[PDB]
Structures are given as C-alpha cells and as structure tokens.
Design a protein around this ligand. Structure first.
Ligand SMILES: [C]O[C]1[C]([O])[C]([C]OP([O])(=O)OP([O])(=O)OP([O])(=O)O[C][C]2O[C](N3=[C]N([C])C4=C3N=C([N])[N]C4=O)[C]([O])[C]2[O])O[C]1N1[C]=NC2=C1N=[C]N=C2[N]
Ligand SMILES: C[n+]1cn([C@@H]2O[C@H](COP(=O)(O)OP(=O)(O)OP(=O)(O)O)[C@@H](O)[C@H]2O)c2nc(N)[nH]c(=O)c21
Ligand SMILES: Nc1ncnc2c1ncn2[C@@H]1O[C@H](CSCC[C@H](N)C(=O)O)[C@@H](O)[C@H]1O
Ligand SMILES: [Cl-]
Ligand SMILES: [Zn+2]
Ligand SMILES: [Zn+2]
Lengths: 299, 115
C-alpha cells in the first residue's frame, strides 16, 4: 500500500509528459480487478467522489452563480449518480445542466436528451465534465487511432463555450481518445491525466484542463501524448483503493467567490493571464442561461 | 377523469410480494447531519443514509406527471434521508411517510414536537 493509496487517485507525473513514446497496447497488471466499496455505494458515485476530491486541490475558479455542464450523465440504470455527486460537491446556487444520448432522471437544474451534437447554448460555462464513452469503442478491429464522434463536438464546445479561467475534466480510455483534445490541454495554465484509485484497474483517466487561457501556452502532439499516457499506465501499476471515500469532512467545494468580468480580446494582457492561471478570474458574459436541443423532423 | 394513482398501485404491488424499485443513488457523507427528511445537501445522521431525490421519486422514476400545481417535484435536486432500517425501499418510504412542517424531521422517525 503506497502513500498514494490514501489519495483520491494518481495524476500522470511531469516526467512522463516530456517523453516521446510510440503507441503500444495497454496491458495493466491488475486489469479486470474490482475495488472494495463502502456498503451500498455505486461504482460511479465512488468514481465521481474521488474526481471531485482531486479537483478540490486545483486552482479552480469558483464564482457566485457558477455554471457547470455535465455530458454523459445518463446510465443503463436510468439515473445520474455522477450528477448526484456534482450537486453534493458544488456550492448552493450553482447552475448544473446535464445531458446524455438516452433518457435518464437527474438532480440537475436542466437535463437535455439526445446526441451532444444537437445541444446548443448562447452562454459560456465555468466547468465542463464529460463521462461520454461510445460502446462501439469496444470493437478494436484495427489500429488504435484518434477517435472522432462526440470528441469533435467537445473540442468545439471547449474553444467556443468555455469561459477563460474555466476548467474541464474529460473521460478517456486506451481506445476512447482524441488527439485534438490532447493538443487543447496546452491552452490551459496546467493539465494532467487523472486516474481514480477505485477504478485504477481501467485504462480510463480524466484529462483535466485547469484555467483556460484561450490561446496555446504549450505545443502538444496528441498522438505522442496519448502514447506517453499508455506508457505511464503500463509501467506504473496503481493499487485499487477506496480509502479516500471514508473521510467526507472536507468534500464540498469552497465558494472562492472568484470575480466574473466581461472583457474583450483587447484587455487580455499579462496581468490578466496571471489572474486566470490562479483561478482568481473568470472572463465571460453574465447574461441569463439559454440552452436548446435540435430536433430532426422525419416522417 | 381517469387519474392514474401509481402511488397506490405501488403499495398494492409491494404488499403482493413485489421487488422494490432499485438503483436509488446512495451518497457518501459523514453521517453527522441534522437528520431532516429533505435537504439541499446530504444530512444523514448515524441512523440514516442519504440519497439523491430524483432517484427516490416514483413520478420521476416512472416518467409520469407529478400531482402538484405546475408539476413541481420537491425531491428532484435535493437529498432524502432514509432510516438505515428502511433503506431497502427508499421510494416506498417517501410515499408511506410524512414530513413535519415545524421541525422538518420525518413524523414517526425523529420529529419530537409532541414529547
Ligand atoms: C462508466 O464508464 C465506463 C467504464 O468505467 C469506463 C472504462 O471501462 P473499461 O472497460 O475499463 O475500459 P478499458 O478496457 O480499460 O479501455 P477501452 O478503451 O475500452 O479498451 C477496449 C478493449 O481493449 C482491451 N483492453 C484495454 N485494456 C486497457 C486492457 C485490455 N485488455 C487487457 N488484457 N488488459 C488491459 O489493460 C479490452 O478488450 C477492452 O474491451 O468506460 C466506460 N464504459 C466502458 N464500457 C462501456 C462504457 N460506457 C458505456 N457503455 C459501455 N459499454
Ligand atoms: C496542481 N497544479 C499544478 N500546477 C503547476 O504545476 C507545478 C507542479 O505540479 P504538482 O501538482 O506536482 O505540484 P507540487 O507537488 O510541486 O506542489 P506541492 O503540493 O505544493 O508540493 C505547480 O507548482 C504549478 O506550477 C498548477 N497550476 C495551476 N494553475 N493550477 C493547479 O491546480 C496546478
Ligand atoms: N454522442 C453522444 N452524445 C451524448 N451522450 C453520449 C454520446 N455517446 C455516448 N454517450 C453517453 O455516454 C455515457 C457513458 S456512461 C455515463 C455514466 C454516468 N456518468 C454516470 O454517472 O453513471 C452513456 O450514457 C452514453 O449514452
Ligand atoms: Cl499523484
Ligand atoms: Zn419527482
Ligand atoms: Zn416536528
């Protein structure tokens, strides 16, 4: 039991990010093993709780009337466990919208049903969480290439609807991944690939972009960086652990009361980027929130 | 008007030895809260388990209309505390029991506005 068994999960070390590996198969030492969960707790409740526990340690910008959108919030069970946790984690008064391809009941303020490509919104968001995964990814019939689908929408949504100073957490796997998404992590003050301790036996990780700067700070090759991630996962077996779930005393996200300003592409200087990079500032309109779901009309 | 009374059709389905509605979302908490029935955040005590409201609401879980002016749901977006002993069927518990408007506890499980 390493000192990381007591953490909510493990973040990809900086030295692994600087390598230039070739993509290899992901062969985890404990693949298929299950973690021991607190009695009656669902896997996705444990998983979302560890992710939020980890997000609490980052320089997230947390303003009043914060805006969080959650893609891939449904499940075959018909409920939204991850949305239940985000609701628990976020400060009261936080607007939480969730969405999924299939119907499901949620504790979110608004729920949009349908492909993410049909979701539109006038407003920018402060935090984006995606747990979307296409079950067809399980058909490995060729090379492990950069997948498109909802990943294309996500790269567009981040560049167009994420407030500067805003953060993201996007679920990826060995085969469920996209190169443009890795390239985008370079447009944040900081980024990492985070593995939850309860699901440490899966190639799954959340790419976390912290404090969006709107422009590239780092040049990242997605094809190289995903190989660097698989290399790290292949060479660093992580011990399954649910210990962080037993202390829920510090869980709720602190309402840092981050400042929200409506500047144009002109007032963006170094004094500003500095404040964005420390989650001290959110830059976006503060208009009322409007979302729509396109409806294709056939016979 | 043929008003579909599912609230009772469930009571009649349980009493006939029927399996309770599953996949209610139980939350992780300290178990050191007020113990109140409905709360903006998990408030379970050492004797209660907290759940997400939407997952415990029969109307929400059956995709039907909420008997309420403007169809407002008072579980969706909140957390319901269920006595650890009756946690096997949280949906059933939220129908058969009533909340005290004075202290906010469940009448019959915490509400002591009589003794
Ligand atoms: C809620 O979130 C879900 C999960 O929690 C999360 C992670 O799930 P995962 O299964 O762990 O993923 P993975 O196997 O680690 O990666 P992969 O990209 O699916 O690999 C594809 C393929 O490659 C092989 N492989 C991959 N790896 C890493 C291997 C290995 N073989 C080994 N011997 N050793 C290994 O280390 C194996 O054959 C795999 O099938 O993904 C979501 N999700 C999964 N399935 C669905 C779904 N959501 C919706 N519908 C779904 N049907
Ligand atoms: C966690 N994090 C990492 N960094 C940057 O990456 C550096 C090293 O990343 P690190 O997470 O390994 O920090 P370290 O373990 O050195 O810090 P300690 O816990 O205080 O000892 C940080 O000092 C920052 O420059 C971060 N930068 C920003 N803006 N926000 C973050 O949340 C953040
Ligand atoms: N293009 C797409 N648009 C929207 N949702 C999608 C999608 N492709 C996959 N998904 C959804 O992604 C989800 C992955 S599993 C999500 C589990 C959920 N986060 C929880 O808390 O339990 C599935 O529900 C699937 O329907
Ligand atoms: Cl770590
Ligand atoms: Zn309801
Ligand atoms: Zn009372």
């Amino acid at each position: 039991a390493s000192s990381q068994a007591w953490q909510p999960g493990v973040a990809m070390p900086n030295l692994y990010k600087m390598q230039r590996m070739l993509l290899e198969k992901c062969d985890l030492q404990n693949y298929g093993d299950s973690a021991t969960l607190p009695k009656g707790i669902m896997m996705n409740v444990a998983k979302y709780t560890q992710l939020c526990q980890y997000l609490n340690t980052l320089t997230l910008a947390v303003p009043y009337n914060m805006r969080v959108i959650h893609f891939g919030a449904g499940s075959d069970k018909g409920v939204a466990p991850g949305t239940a946790v985000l609701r628990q984690w976020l400060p009261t008064g936080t607007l939480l919208v969730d969405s999924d391809l299939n119907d499901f009941v949620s504790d979110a303020d608004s729920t949009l049903i349908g492909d993410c490509a049909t979701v539109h919104t006038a407003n920018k968001w402060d935090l984006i969480i995606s747990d979307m995964y296409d079950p067809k990814t399980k058909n490995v019939t060729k090379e492990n290439d950069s997948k498109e689908g909802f990943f294309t929408y996500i790269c567009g949504f981040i560049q167009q609807k994420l407030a500067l100073g805003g953060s993201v957490a996007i679920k990826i796997t060995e085969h469920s991944w996209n190169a443009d998404l890795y390239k985008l992590m370079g447009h944040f003050a900081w980024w990492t690939a985070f593995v939850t301790n309860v699901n440490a036996s899966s190639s799954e990780a959340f790419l976390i972009g912290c404090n969006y700067l709107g422009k590239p700070r780092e040049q990242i090759d997605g094809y190289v960086m995903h190989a660097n991630y698989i290399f790290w996962r292949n060479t660093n077996p992580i011990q399954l652990s649910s210990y962080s779930l037993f202390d829920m005393s510090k869980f709720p996200l602190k309402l840092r009361g981050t400042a929200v300003m409506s500047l144009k592409e002109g007032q963006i200087n170094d004094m500003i980027l500095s404040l964005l990079s420390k989650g001290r500032l959110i830059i976006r309109e503060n208009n009322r929130v409007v979302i729509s779901s396109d409806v294709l009309v056939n016979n | 008007a043929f008003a579909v009374d599912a609230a009772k059709a469930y009571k009649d389905y349980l009493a006939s030895g029927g399996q309770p509605i599953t996949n209610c979302v139980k939350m992780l908490c300290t178990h050191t809260g007020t113990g109140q029935a409905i709360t903006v955040t998990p408030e379970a005590n050492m004797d209660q388990e907290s759940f997400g409201g939407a997952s415990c609401c029969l109307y929400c879980r059956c995709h039907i209309d909420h008997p309420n002016p403007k169809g407002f749901c008072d579980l969706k977006g909140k957390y319901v505390q269920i006595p650890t002993t009756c946690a096997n069927d949280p949906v059933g518990f939220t129908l058969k029991n009533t909340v005290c408007t004075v202290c906010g506890m469940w009448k019959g499980y915490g509400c002591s506005c009589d003794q």
